[PDB]
Amino acid sequence: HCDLPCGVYDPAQARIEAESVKAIQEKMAANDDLHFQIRATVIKEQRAELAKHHLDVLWSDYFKPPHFESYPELHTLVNEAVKALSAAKASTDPATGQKALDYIAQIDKIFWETKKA
Amino acid sequence: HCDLPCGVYDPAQARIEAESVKAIQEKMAANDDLHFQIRATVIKEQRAELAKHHLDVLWSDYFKPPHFESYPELHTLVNEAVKALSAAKASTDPATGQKALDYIAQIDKIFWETKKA
Amino acid sequence: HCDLPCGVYDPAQARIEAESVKAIQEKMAANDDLHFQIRATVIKEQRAELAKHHLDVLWSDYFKPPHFESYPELHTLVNEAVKALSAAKASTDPATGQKALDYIAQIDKIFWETKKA
Amino acid sequence: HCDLPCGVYDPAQARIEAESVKAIQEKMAANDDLHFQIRATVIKEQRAELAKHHLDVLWSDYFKPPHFESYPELHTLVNEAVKALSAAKASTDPATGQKALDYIAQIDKIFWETKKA
Amino acid sequence: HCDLPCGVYDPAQARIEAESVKAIQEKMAANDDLHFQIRATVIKEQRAELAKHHLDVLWSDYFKPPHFESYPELHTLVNEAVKALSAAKASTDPATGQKALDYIAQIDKIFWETKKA
Amino acid sequence: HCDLPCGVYDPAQARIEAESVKAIQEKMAANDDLHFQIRATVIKEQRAELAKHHLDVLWSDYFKPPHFESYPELHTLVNEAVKALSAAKASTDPATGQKALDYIAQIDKIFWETKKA
Ligand code: NI
Ligand code: NI
Ligand code: NI
Ligand code: NI
Ligand code: NI
Ligand code: NI
- Integer-rounded Cα Rg, in Å, for chain B is 15
CA gap E61, E59 in Å, rounded: 6
| Residue type at D64 in one-letter notation | K
- Among B3, B68, B86, the residue with its CB nearest the CB of A3 is B86
- Whole-angstrom distance between the N-terminal and C-terminal Cα of chain B? 20
DSSP line for D48-106: HHHHHHHHHHIIIII--HHHHHHSTTHHHHHHHHHHHHHHHHT---HHHHHHHHHHHHH
Chain B residues inside the 8 Å CB shell of C43 = 2-4, 6
Neighbouring C-alpha atoms within 13 Å toward the C-beta of A20: 28
Q: Apex CA D88: angle with CA D68 and CA A57, to 5°?
A: 90
CA gap D58, D114 in Å, rounded: 12
CA gap F19, F101 in Å, rounded: 7
**Region of residue F26 (phi > 0: left; psi between -120 and 50: alpha; otherwise: beta):** alpha
Does residue C81 contact residue C103 with C-beta atoms inside 8 Å? yes
Rounded to an integer, what is the distance from CA B112 to the centroid of its chain? Answer: 16
Residues 41-60 of E with CB under 8 A from A: 41-42, 45
Does residue D48 contact residue D91 with C-beta atoms inside 8 Å? no
Ligand 4 midpoint to CA A40 (Å): 10
- The three-state secondary structure class of F64 is coil
Chain C residues inside the 8 Å CB shell of E35 = 37, 41, 90, 92
Residue F113's CATH number: 1.20.120.400
Q: Do D and C touch, counting CB pairs below 8 Å (3 needed)? A: no
B111 contact partners, CB below 8 Å, separation of at least 6: B9, B11, B58, B62
Residue E40 Cα distances to C24, C76, C109, E54, F56, angstroms: 19, 28, 35, 21, 22
Chain E residues inside the 8 Å CB shell of C41 = 35, 38-39, 42
- Cis amide prior to A11 (ω within 30 degrees): no
CA gap F3, F5 in Å, rounded: 4
Residue A59 Cα distances to A63, B63, B101, E19, F109, angstroms: 5, 16, 20, 42, 52
- Quote the minimal CA–CA distance from E15 to chain D in Å: 17
Ligand 3 midpoint to CA B43 (Å): 8
A94 contact partners, CB below 8 Å, separation of at least 6: A22, A25, A26, A29
- The three-state secondary structure class of E11 is coil
Q: Other CB atoms closer than 10 Å to residue D73's CB: what's the count?
A: 11
CA gap D105, C113 in Å, rounded: 60
Q: How many residues does chain B have?
A: 117
CA gap D2, B82 in Å, rounded: 29
Determine the residue of chain A that is closest to E91 in CA distance. Answer: A35
A60 contact partners, CB below 8 Å, separation of at least 6: B52, B56, B79, B82, B83, B86
Does residue B75 contact residue B63 with C-beta atoms inside 8 Å? no
Q: Apex CA D73: angle with CA D67 and CA D78, to 5°?
A: 85
B108 contact partners, CB below 8 Å, separation of at least 6: B11, B12, B15
Residue B82 Cα distances to A13, A58, B77, E114, F113, angstroms: 20, 12, 9, 49, 51
Q: Apex CA E45: angle with CA E40 and CA E51, to 5°?
A: 120
E68 contact partners, CB below 8 Å, separation of at least 6: D75, D76, D79, E74, E75
Best to test chain F binding among B38, B44, B46, B47 (most F CBs inside 10 Å): B38
Does residue E103 contact residue D60 with C-beta atoms inside 8 Å? no
- The three-state secondary structure class of F33 is coil
Longest distance between any two alpha carbons in chain C, whole Å: 50
Run of H or E residues at E80: helix E74-89
Q: Other CB atoms closer than 10 Å to residue F68's CB: what's the count?
A: 16
Phi, psi of A49 (to 5 degrees): -65, -45
- Quote the minimal CA–CA distance from F30 to chain C in Å: 24
Answer yes or no: do B39 and F92 touch at CB < 8 A.
no
Of D116, D44, D31, the C-alpha closest to D85 is D44
Determine the residue of chain C that is closest to A92 in CA distance. Answer: C35
Phi, psi of E63 (to 5 degrees): -70, 130
Does residue A12 contact residue A112 with C-beta atoms inside 8 Å? no
E57 contact partners, CB below 8 Å, separation of at least 6: E1, E9
Burial profile B45-61: b = 16 or more Cβ within 10 angstroms, e = fewer: bbbbbbbbbbbbbbbbb
- Quote the minimal CA–CA distance from C49 to chain A in Å: 16
F94 contact partners, CB below 8 Å, separation of at least 6: F22, F25, F26, F29
F40 contact partners, CB below 8 Å, separation of at least 6: E4, F24, F27, F28
Chain F residues inside the 8 Å CB shell of E16 = 1, 8, 10, 12-13
- Quote the minimal CA–CA distance from E57 to chain F in Å: 14
Task: Report yes or no: A38 at the E interface, CB cutoff 8 Å.
Answer: yes
CA gap E63, D93 in Å, rounded: 25
Q: Which domain holds residue B16?
A: 1-117
CA gap C69, F115 in Å, rounded: 29
Of B113, B115, B14, B103, the C-alpha closest to B71 is B113
CA gap A41, C36 in Å, rounded: 9
DSSP line for C9-57: --THHHHHHHHHHHHHHHHHTS---HHHHHHHHHHHHHHHHHHHHHHHH
Phi, psi of D45 (to 5 degrees): -60, -45
CA gap D68, B30 in Å, rounded: 57
Answer yes or no: do F6 and E20 touch at CB < 8 A.
yes
Residue D78 Cα distances to B117, D11, D86, E65, angstroms: 57, 11, 13, 12
Which burial class, exposed, middle or buried, applies to D106 when counting CB atoms under 10 A from its CB (0-12, 13-18, 19+)?
Answer: middle
Tell me which method was used to determine the 3D structure. X-ray
**What angle in degrees, to the nearest 10, is found between the helix axes of C94-116 and C12-28?**
170
Phi, psi of C95 (to 5 degrees): -65, -30
Q: How many residues does chain C have?
A: 117
- The three-state secondary structure class of F73 is coil
**What angle in degrees, to the nearest 10, is found between the helix axes of D12-30 and D74-89?**
30
**Region of residue E3 (phi > 0: left; psi between -120 and 50: alpha; otherwise: beta):** left
**How many domains, chain B?**
1
DSSP line for chain B: --SS------THHHHHHHHHHHHHHHHHHH---HHHHHHHHHHHHHHHHHHHHHHHHIIIII--HHHHHH-TTHHHHHHHHHHHHHHHHT---HHHHHHHHHHHHHHHHHHHHHHH-
Q: Apex CA B21: angle with CA B16 and CA B23, to 5°?
A: 90
CA gap A76, A96 in Å, rounded: 18
Ligand 4 midpoint to CA C42 (Å): 18
Ligand 3 midpoint to CA B95 (Å): 19
- Integer-rounded Cα Rg, in Å, for chain A is 15
DSSP line for chain A: --SS--S---THHHHHHHHHHHHHHHHHTS---HHHHHHHHHHHHHHHHHHHHHHHHIIIII--HHHHHH-TTHHHHHHHHHHHHHHHHT---HHHHHHHHHHHHHHHHHHHHHHH-
CA gap A52, A74 in Å, rounded: 15
Q: Other CB atoms closer than 10 Å to residue A7's CB: what's the count?
A: 14
